[PDB]
Amino acid sequence: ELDQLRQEAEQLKNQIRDARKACADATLSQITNNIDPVGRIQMRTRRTLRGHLAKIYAMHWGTDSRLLVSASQDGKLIIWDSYTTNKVHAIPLRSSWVMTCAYAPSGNYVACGGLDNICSIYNLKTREGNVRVSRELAGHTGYLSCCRFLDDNQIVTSSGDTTCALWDIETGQQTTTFTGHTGDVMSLSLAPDTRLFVSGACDASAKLWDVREGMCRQTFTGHESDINAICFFPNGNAFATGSDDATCRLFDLRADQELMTYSHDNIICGITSVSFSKSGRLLLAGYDDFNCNVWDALKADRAGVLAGHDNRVSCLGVTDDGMAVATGSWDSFLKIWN
Amino acid sequence: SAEERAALERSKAIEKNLKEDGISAAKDVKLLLLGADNSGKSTIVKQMKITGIVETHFTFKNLHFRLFDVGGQRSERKKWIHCFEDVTAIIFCVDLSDRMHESLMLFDSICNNKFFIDTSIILFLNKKDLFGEKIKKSPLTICFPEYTGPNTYEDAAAYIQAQFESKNRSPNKEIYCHMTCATDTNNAQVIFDAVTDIIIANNLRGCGLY
């Protein structure tokens, strides 16, 4: 009955493609062709954070738009003060092979993962003064490529063994495991309401999970190579996925397909990080070509360039209040733009 | 700056701690260990003293080798192999007894990798005795259909080494090959001397004199 099941799957895929095509009556560009462009966005490095000595692989902003945790292959996760370029914490990691870091929305905890297959949760507001590992979540068979805090208690982690798992940091057990990816899951972003999240896997597919039910809802397959980054629109009804195909695309959750693709002819390096502005008009994309291009998310043209990085930018994140955008690169430099 | 003078003091304290930690951690010779499954990686890592990534740090003649046996990551290499650049060398183990085409493909993938265009490979050929016994039992033409020549242990080993060392194309890197039987203590001096040569070459390149 395997052949019958394969035929059913193929015809269901054809039906899904037909439905997505029928839902398309006008693209994004034809609707945003009558609005004024944002113009050239001149963005200057206001602060530069020189604390790391190895390639910075991830960074996350505090919910108060002031603190920033930065994780590098140096084996450290320095928590930064963006306004006063100070360092408030320097947490030595057990495993120096770190590929992700998260800052809890309450600010009490900092997660961290990598090639050790284990997400390490750190307690910043400890009575003893120091930062101590409150939990080490060990349930993955592959490198943990992303981890995002739902709240102080539960964290969703994306791993390199084709699985995303929702955890319970109090008891250290997988509350839910999300399966369905056919390759490494190298990116993850939780919705503003944190009731659902998307992941961008390295099989050129991005799936839409919801943590409560624990099952995938929609899959968006538009890319031609591994998806290296993903980020929700602030409305929570869209997200943009940046791939190694040197293109980042805007997907609409309700329309269930692409909206626009952000590519330029002289761009060949693959995306490493995609982030949005507070209003969602600017889509800042990090490139392996040492530059971050600021894309007019509605006009799909380069509104500016964030030049000044001597190596591939590995992470980019806009503050929750939209004041600044911070970029980390492989030259161990974290730069705050505004 | 009223009591932020205490905050700047703390920031400078942990900044000097970061600097000291980086100085201490730059003294270590990082080595990446690859090779096919059951290719003697465990045998050499358990003979040079001391689930996903297994680091075996040890000291030999004042060189702190940090050897990363990353064979436990059964996933796509391309997504995490870029974090292993700036490694001093890539130790490559090959099972001469078993499992040669896969090793050749892996060596071609890793020697022409975009991040390892300068990182030289210390190539190991373990199970020499088993290879010789198998040659005495079975011809070496089984592995290589286009192999023409004498069927002795020395010529077969030389042909295998030539096939492995012909996979590189960057003139800035060299492949150091060795013969091992796994019943030896000479699998560490070879690594040490190859690493010294790589260190002097990288120092000369950094100065621009090379």
Partner: single-chain antibody
Framework: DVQLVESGGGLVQPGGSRKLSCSAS????????MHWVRQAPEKGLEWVAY????????YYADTVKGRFTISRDDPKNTLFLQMTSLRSEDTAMYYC??????????????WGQGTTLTVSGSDIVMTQATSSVPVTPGESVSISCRSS???????????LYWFLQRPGQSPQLLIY???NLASGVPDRFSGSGSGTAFTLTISRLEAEDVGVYYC?????????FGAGTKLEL
């Protein structure tokens, strides 16, 4: 748990010397800037000295400079306050206070127990108008404390602290930076103010909340305590 036990206090003849040691355990003493706060038998608190993390910066009061010295022993987890030429006005009960400083930190959060020591112009003048209030459980009480200078710094943070010294106990930080409630303090305690005039409001006052409330600024060393408003049952 976190424990700051100090000893070395007793009857000292005038003109003598005495060393106080503050044994610390349960926390990372190395990264904490440690203070010394004294309290005369009939007066309020009065800041004495301060040694920062890493023994970098040391401060003293006007009546302390030269006479005292503050040292710490990070490997031994002990803080020393060597005193020289102890006058008759140096009698007090010297407390040990840990005040780690970073963005969002909670300075003065834990206080030692104290050792009684029975000895035989540009500063911020912070005065509390009322020195005692009669209150009843279940009622709301507000304590005020006016400052000479504006404590609202240009960075948006006003540096006013509120401490409660229950009878027979050590002060416990209640409100730090004039609006933030310290960890472990019940939510019924609230603080407010504007630049110079500050007030702390307590809702549903309980029998365990009776004591003497002190107001403190941290804008500049030396640090001036309030007279101390005492609320009795």
């Amino acid at each position: 748990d976190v424990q700051l036990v100090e000893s070395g206090g007793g009857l000292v003849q005038p003109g003598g010397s005495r060393k106080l040691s503050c044994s610390a355990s349960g926390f990372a003493f190395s990264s904490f800037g440690m203070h010394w706060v004294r309290q005369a038998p009939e007066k309020g608190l009065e800041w004495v000295a301060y040694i920062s993390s890493g023994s970098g910066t040391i401060y003293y009061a006007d009546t302390v400079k030269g006479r005292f010295t503050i040292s710490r022993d990070d490997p031994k987890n002990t803080l020393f306050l060597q005193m020289t030429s102890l006058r008759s006005e140096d009698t007090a009960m010297y407390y040990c206070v840990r005040s780690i400083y970073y963005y969002g930190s909670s300075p003065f959060d834990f206080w030692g127990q104290g050792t009684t020591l029975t000895v035989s112009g540009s500063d911020i003048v912070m005065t509390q108008a009322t020195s005692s209030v009669p209150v009843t459980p279940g009622e709301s009480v507000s304590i005020s404390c006016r400052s000479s200078k504006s404590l609202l710094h240009s960075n948006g943070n006003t540096y006013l602290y509120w401490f409660l010294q229950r009878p027979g106990q050590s002060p416990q930080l209640l409100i730090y930076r004039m609006s933030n409630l310290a960890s472990g303090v019940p939510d019924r305690f609230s603080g407010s103010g504007s630049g110079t005039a500050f007030t702390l409001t307590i809702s549903r006052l309980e029998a365990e909340d009776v004591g003497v409330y002190y107001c403190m600024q941290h804008l500049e060393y030396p640090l001036t305590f309030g007279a101390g408003t005492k609320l009795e049952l």
